[PDB]
C-alpha cells in the first residue's frame, strides 16, 4: 500500500504511517531490485526478518536526484534542513527508486512543492507544515510579499526529458521504533514435517528432541501442548495443520 501507492504526498507535507499487527517481510521488497538505493542505518539490509520491532514508520514522498543523497542520517541540505530532518542515530532503511517513467509528464508535473526557505533546521523527524509566507526584510509582510519577502513553497514541474537531477525519484523511509510488546516482526520459515525419526524439533515456542508420531489425543481448540504427570512435554499441536 505504501510502495505501490499511486497517490503520494509532497515533501513539505512529508508523511508518516505507524503500522501494527504485521508480519513485515522486508526481503520481498529488498529482493525486488526496483530500488535505486536501499540504504540501511543501525541495521543490516539482510538479517532483518529476524527482528521484531514495536512499530515501523513509513514516510513516503518524492524528491529529485541529488536530494536522495541528501536523505541520510544527520545531513544538511534544502530538504533535510527544511522539509524532513533525519537524526544522526536513525535506525531504518531509505528506499529510493526512479519514477520518471510514471510521474514525469510533458510540460511539467507541477504538483510537488518543496519548502524554499525557512529560518531554522528541523528537529529529528520534525513535521513542519506551516504555510506562513516567508517573512524577511524589516516588516511583517502581512501577505503582500514585500521586499526580501517571498513564498516558502516552490513547485517542481517534472518535464519528462529532464535529466536524472530533475527526475521524480520516489522515496520511502522506514524507521524502527522500540519501546512494550513487539507487534510487528519478520516472518519465520517452517520446514516440512518429518515423522518416525529422532529429530531435533523446534515447534513455534518450544524445542527438544523426539520422535514425532501421529497421535489420537484430542486437544481443546485453543490448547497447544500436552504434558505428562511429571510436567514433561508429550504432545504438540502442529501449528500449521491442526
Amino acid at each position: 500500500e505504501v510502495f505501490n501507492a499511486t497517490r503520494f504526498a509532497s515533501v513539505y507535507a512529508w508523511n508518516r504511517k505507524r503500522i501494527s499487527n504485521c508480519v513485515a517481510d522486508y526481503s520481498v521488497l529488498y529482493n525486488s531490485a526496483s530500488f535505486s538505493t536501499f540504504k540501511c542505518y543501525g541495521v543490516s539490509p539482510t538479517k532483518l526478518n529476524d527482528l521484531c520491532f514495536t512499530n515501523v514508520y513509513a514516510d513516503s514522498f518524492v524528491i529529485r536526484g541529488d536530494e536522495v543523497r541528501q536523505i541520510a542520517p544527520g545531513q544538511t541540505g534544502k530538504i533535510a534542513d527544511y522539509n524532513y530532518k533525519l537524526p544522526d542515530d536513525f535506525t531504518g532503511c531509505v528506499i529510493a527508486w526512479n519514477s520518471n517513467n510514471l510521474d514525469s509528464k510533458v510540460g511539467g508535473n507541477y504538483n510537488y512543492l518543496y519548502r524554499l526557505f525557512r529560518k531554522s533546521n528541523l528537529k529529528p523527524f520534525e513535521r513542519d507544515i506551516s504555510t506562513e509566507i516567508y517573512q524577511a526584510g524589516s516588516t511583517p509582510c502581512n501577505g503582500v510579499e514585500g521586499f526580501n519577502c517571498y513564498f516558502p513553497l516552490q513547485s517542481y514541474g517534472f518535464q519528462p526529458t529532464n535529466g536524472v537531477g530533475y527526475q521524480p525519484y520516489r522515496v520511502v523511509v522506514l524507521s524502527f521504533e522500540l519501546l512494550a510488546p513487539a507487534t510487528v516482526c519478520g516472518p519465520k520459515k517452517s520446514t516440512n514435517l518429518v515423522k518416525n525419526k529422532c529429530v531435533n524439533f523446534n515447534f513455534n515456542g518450544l524445542t527438544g528432541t523426539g520422535v514425532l508420531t501421529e497421535s489420537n489425543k484430542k486437544f481443546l481448540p485453543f490448547q497447544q501442548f500436552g504434558r505428562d504427570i511429571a510436567d514433561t512435554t508429550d504432545a504438540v499441536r502442529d501449528p500449521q495443520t491442526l
Partner: antibody
Amino acid sequence: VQLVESGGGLIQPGGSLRLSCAASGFTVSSNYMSWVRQAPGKGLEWVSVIYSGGSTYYADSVKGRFTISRDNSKNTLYLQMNSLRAEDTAVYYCARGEGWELPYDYWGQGTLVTVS
Amino acid sequence: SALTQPPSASGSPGQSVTISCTGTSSDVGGYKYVSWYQQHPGKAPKLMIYEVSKRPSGVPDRFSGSKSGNTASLTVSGLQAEDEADYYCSSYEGSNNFVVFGGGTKLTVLG
C-alpha cells in the same frame, strides 16, 4: 544595502582577514548570505555561504580552510581564510543571495584582496 | 564544464547580437535554470538571464535570449552606447552543489 567590505589588502599566507561586510542595508542574520571573490580577469569563486539555519558550505579549493562568521545582529559579516595560496589572488565581494536559487543581486563596493 | 564563450563579438550600434554560452550536456542539457550576468568593467556582477524566458526586474527589454539544447544564448537587440561590458554565465553543476560560472565574453565595438 550598504555592504562596505573592509580589511582587504596584500597579505602573505597565514593571516586571517576578518572582512567586515556591513549589513547596514540588508540583514545577514537569520537569513541567507554568501561570500565570493573574483581573480584578475576571471569569473566569481563560490567560497562560502551561510543559511538561515546557520549552515555553511565551501567549494573545493576552499573546503577545510575557509570559514564564515558574523556578529549576531546586522552589525557585520565575516569570512575567515586559512593557509592562503597564490591562486587565491582575487578581489573579494559579497553576494546577497544563496546559491543557484535566490540569485545574487546586491554586492559590496569591492575590497582589493591580493593573495600571493 | 565551464560555460565557455568566444571572448569577443563585434557589431553595429542599433543591431542585435547573440552572446553564446556553451558547456557540455553534463550541465546545460540536464537542468532548466541558467543565469546570465553582464558587468561593466568595475560594476557589480549584474544578472541578466535567469529563468531564461525571464530577466531581472528593471533590466531593459532588448535582452531575453533563449536556450537551445546544448547552449544558452542571450539575444540583445539594438546595440546601445551602453552595451559594451563583460559577460559571465552561471548555473549548477551535476554534482555536490557546485556552481559553475562563465569564462568571459567581451563585447568589442569597432572604433
